[PDB]
Amino acid sequence: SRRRVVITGMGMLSPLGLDVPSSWEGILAGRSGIAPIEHMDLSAYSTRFGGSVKGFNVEEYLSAKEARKLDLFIQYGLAASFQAVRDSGLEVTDANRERIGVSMGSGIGGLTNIENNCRSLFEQGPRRISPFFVPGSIINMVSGFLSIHLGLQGPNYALTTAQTTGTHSIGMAARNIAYGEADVMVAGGSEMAACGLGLGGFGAARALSTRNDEPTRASRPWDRDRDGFVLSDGSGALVLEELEHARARGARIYAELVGFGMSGDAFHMTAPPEDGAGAARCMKNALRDAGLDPRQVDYINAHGTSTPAGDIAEIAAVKSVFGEHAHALSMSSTKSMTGHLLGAAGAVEAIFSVLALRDQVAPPTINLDNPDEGCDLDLVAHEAKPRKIDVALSNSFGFGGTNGTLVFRRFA
Amino acid sequence: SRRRVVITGMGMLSPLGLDVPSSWEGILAGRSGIAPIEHMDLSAYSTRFGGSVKGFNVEEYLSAKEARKLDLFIQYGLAASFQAVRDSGLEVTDANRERIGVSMGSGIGGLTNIENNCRSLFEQGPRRISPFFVPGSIINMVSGFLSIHLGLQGPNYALTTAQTTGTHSIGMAARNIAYGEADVMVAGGSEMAACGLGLGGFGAARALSTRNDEPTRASRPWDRDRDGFVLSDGSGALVLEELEHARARGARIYAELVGFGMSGDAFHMTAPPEDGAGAARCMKNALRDAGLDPRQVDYINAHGTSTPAGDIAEIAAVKSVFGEHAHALSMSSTKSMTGHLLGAAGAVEAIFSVLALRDQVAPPTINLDNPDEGCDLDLVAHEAKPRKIDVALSNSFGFGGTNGTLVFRRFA
Ligand SMILES: COCC(=O)Nc1ccccc1
Numbered sequence: 001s002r003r004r005v006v007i008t009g010m011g012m013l014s015p016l017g018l019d020v021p022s023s024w025e026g027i028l029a030g031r032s033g034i035a036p037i038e039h040m041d042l043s044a045y046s047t048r049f050g051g052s053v054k055g056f057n058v059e060e061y062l063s064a065k066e067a068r069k070l071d072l073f074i075q076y077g078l079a080a081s082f083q084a085v086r087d088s089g090l091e092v093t094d095a096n097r098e099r100i101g102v103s104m105g106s107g108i109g110g111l112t113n114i115e116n117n118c119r120s121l122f123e124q125g126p127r128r129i130s131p132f133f134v135p136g137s138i139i140n141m142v143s144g145f146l147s148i149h150l151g152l153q154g155p156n157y158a159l160t161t162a163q164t165t166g167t168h169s170i171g172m173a174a175r176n177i178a179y180g181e182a183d184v185m186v187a188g189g190s191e192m193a194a195c196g197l198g199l200g201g202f203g204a205a206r207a208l209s210t211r212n213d214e215p216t217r218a219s220r221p222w223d224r225d226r227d228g229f230v231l232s233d234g235s236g237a238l239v240l241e242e243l244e245h246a247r248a249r250g251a252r253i254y255a256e257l258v259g260f261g262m263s264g265d266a267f268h269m270t271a272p273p274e275d276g277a278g279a280a281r282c283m284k285n286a287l288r289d290a291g292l293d294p295r296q297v298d299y300i301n302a303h304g305t306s307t308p309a310g311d312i313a314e315i316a317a318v319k320s321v322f323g324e325h326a327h328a329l330s331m332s333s334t335k336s337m338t339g340h341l342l343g344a345a346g347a348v349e350a351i352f353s354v355l356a357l358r359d360q361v362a363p364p365t366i367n368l369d370n371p372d373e374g375c376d377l378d379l380v381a382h383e384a385k386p387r388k389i390d391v392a393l394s395n396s397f398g399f400g401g402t403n404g405t406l407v408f409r410r411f412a
Numbered sequence: 413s414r415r416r417v418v419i420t421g422m423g424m425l426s427p428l429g430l431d432v433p434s435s436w437e438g439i440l441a442g443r444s445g446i447a448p449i450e451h452m453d454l455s456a457y458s459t460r461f462g463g464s465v466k467g468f469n470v471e472e473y474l475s476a477k478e479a480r481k482l483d484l485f486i487q488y489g490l491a492a493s494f495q496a497v498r499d500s501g502l503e504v505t506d507a508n509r510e511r512i513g514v515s516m517g518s519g520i521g522g523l524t525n526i527e528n529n530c531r532s533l534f535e536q537g538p539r540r541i542s543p544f545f546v547p548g549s550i551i552n553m554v555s556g557f558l559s560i561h562l563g564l565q566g567p568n569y570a571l572t573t574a575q576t577t578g579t580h581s582i583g584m585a586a587r588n589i590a591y592g593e594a595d596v597m598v599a600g601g602s603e604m605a606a607c608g609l610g611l612g613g614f615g616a617a618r619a620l621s622t623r624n625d626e627p628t629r630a631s632r633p634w635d636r637d638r639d640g641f642v643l644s645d646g647s648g649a650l651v652l653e654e655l656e657h658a659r660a661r662g663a664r665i666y667a668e669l670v671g672f673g674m675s676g677d678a679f680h681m682t683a684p685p686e687d688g689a690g691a692a693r694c695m696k697n698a699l700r701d702a703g704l705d706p707r708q709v710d711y712i713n714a715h716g717t718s719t720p721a722g723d724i725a726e727i728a729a730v731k732s733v734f735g736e737h738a739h740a741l742s743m744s745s746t747k748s749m750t751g752h753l754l755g756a757a758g759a760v761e762a763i764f765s766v767l768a769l770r771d772q773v774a775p776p777t778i779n780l781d782n783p784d785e786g787c788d789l790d791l792v793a794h795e796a797k798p799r800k801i802d803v804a805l806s807n808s809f810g811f812g813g814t815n816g817t818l819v820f821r822r823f824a
């Protein structure tokens with residue numbers, strides 16, 4: 001047997017805003033957070049735009065001294081974690097601190113501060129490198145720093161499963177609570193890969209939209225004119241909590257995390273299989289974990305990256321899993337608005353899945369002007385769609401063919 | 413309900429050998445794998461030596477054409493995983509590939525790859541960045557490439573918890589099996605942070621021994637003259653397996669994995685607390701998990717990194733957990749010989765811990781000439797000690813106050 005897991009706190013930085021309510025307001029209004037990148041010369045790059053976090057003030061969270069030590073991806077993670085802990089109302093004590101852990105991940109982590117330290121290293125050699133360089137750059141430091149600032153003494157770790165990180169972090173945090181290893185986890189991921197190596201690195205694989213003339217139109221999942229994903233920055237954090245623990249302290253509960261699914265495609269390094277066999281197993285695995293028949297799913301937050309091979313794989317996967325129900329469920333890609341936050345994607349997208357339940361509204365897929373061949377599902381093109389949502393899936397399909405699925409349900 | 417987990421295979425690259433038996437011969441013979449570094453110019457660096465993998469032949473495992481595209485940390489992880497899977501004698505099939513997962517972790521991952529592409533970006537421009545840069549450098553592609561080559565469709569992920577990564581990777585892989593998400597997991601870690609950024613970053617923090625004139629005497633855990641850790645390279649992989657599934661196929665079983673603990677110090681970003689309180693909480697968690705009397709523990713493979721603060725803290729954690737029994741058990745740091753494989757440290761040390769069980773011998777702590785104030789336990793100074801070992805415990809501690817404990821016992 002098993003303990004039930006509920007969402008009691010949520011926090012976020014996105015290209016749409018500096019917290020959940022402002023980001024969600026963007027999602028439902030079909031607003032784009034995509035813009036040419038400022039403060040960085042991208043002249044020599046085939047992509048010149050993305051989702052940046054706009055107007056971020058780290059000193060709302062940290063002294064300027066402790067922020068100088070930390071890559072932007074750590075800052076962003078800590079912001080979402082702090083938002084989420086505050087949102088939860090949870091009081092940490094000597095009595096419960098050993099039962100409260102953190103699992104915040106990143107796809108690449110401290111790329112920006114690595115890039116800035118290479119400069120120092122080749123020009124001037126090793127003596128300029130900062131003392132805080134290693135601890136200020138490694139992925140596990142969001143979990144490290146948050147545990148120290150808050151006195152969290154419970155399972156302390158970080159996933160890095162590329163674009164699946166946020167989904168795997170939340171999912172395996174849930175498992176820690178379900179199986180009695182913790183009563184509370186702060187879980188999700190953060191990403192800031194908007195640096196020469198990120199844009200350059202993805203640019204070299206021609207994985208990125210090159211639609212420099214219309215950055216708001218670049219992210220157009222399931223549309224025949226899409227030409228790869230948009231690179232976006234930010235963070236999601238949820239406070240996961242055991243149900244009796246949450247009820248006892250009178251917490252506001254958003255939704256129940258009822259299921260977690262993992263799988264491997266075991267196919268290709270970057271490209272899913274045409275038929276989404278992997279994503280289909282992962283989804284089947286998640287619904288079984290939740291004890292739910294596929295018919296009961298109402299909303300799917302797709303991966304929906306706006307890559308040609310990835311979007312079509314997800315359609316195949318859903319038709320396969322849901323058969324006669326695949327047209328009844330609504331499925332949108334919020335990346336149409338936010339772009340791809342990589343290891344943070346599944347975190348912000350689990351929050352969007354939780355709010356979709358709170359507000360009975362399916363977020364739009366904007367720019368879905370001309371569906372491709374076989375993209376005839378309910379993809380919620382252009383505008384939000386109010387509707388019944390008892391169960392919501394969030395999907396993440398990553399490099400290595402690492403799949404993750406979270407199943408949320410209305411709580412009462 | 414919770415299923416039992418055994419070790420059916422192991423693999424390794426270490427500074428002492430290109431497999432497990434060749435590494436173990438060096439461990440038992442009290443042999444150092446620390447030497448001046450050859451592959452680069454370290455004259456501008458405060459540390460010019462480490463534990464390199466010597467004579468690694470990647471064409472023993474992969475085509476040169478694929479090897480070229482992958483960072484040494486991925487090559488090291490795949491070689492270790494390949495040895496482990498071959499040693500398990502497991503046959504991957506359509507009947508079982510869905511139940512066979514992989515969790516192989518790293519601290520920093522493709523830092524060499526990141527440094528070279530950094531060199532390409534600044535000296536030439538973004539257009540010179542490898543198309544293979546991202547899939548070839550990110551931490552989760554040991555799990556991804558392994559799954560692609562062997563057809564492993566099970567849970568597919570990677571931890572990055574700095575110097576704890578290997579212990580964490582293995583423990584959580586055993587949770588996957590314990591709770592029935594998988595029947596087999598390939599778990600452990602790989603590290604190749606021996607480049608300008610790694611040696612420089614850790615130098616910047618003054619974390620590294622500077623004993624360039626006697627590199628084999630540098631790593632001296634608990635010795636009064638220790639001046640920091642020795643940076644080393646390699647990989648550890650184990651096949652983790654549900655017990656009945658092991659019995660069902662007549663698998664050779666090296667030992668059983670009975671216990672796993674985690675905790676946060678919640679103390680400092682890089683310094684362990686002087687009393688070892690977080691380490692203590694972790695080992696108690698692990699022992700309760702294993703259903704053990706602390707006095708059953710015969711051998712501890714210590715973190716034993718050869719830093720002033722970390723070493724003293726381990727004694728304090730062990731004396732606090734084990735009381736008067738702390739004097740009867742043998743504790744040793746094989747890092748005295750291998751150096752600190754960082755993210756791979758827990759994986760190779762989990763293997764040493766298992767081989768301590770098979771051969772009934774505690775590996776020595778070499779260079780322990782003058783034990784420090786309070787380091788008055790059986791630290792197996794100088795020479796291997798053949799002795800009764802029914803239970804072995806492996807510790808790892810990391811930046812972020814992140815702790816991991818693995819408990820192995822003999823299986824009949
Ligand atoms: C070395 O590659 C650069 C990069 O941005 N990598 C990544 C970032 C997030 C998710 C997956 C991969």
Ligand SMILES: COCC(=O)Nc1ccccc1
Nearest residue numbers: 134519520574575605610754
């Ligand atoms: C920028 O960091 C360089 C590095 O090697 N970091 C690390 C490697 C292994 C474990 C923990 C940290």
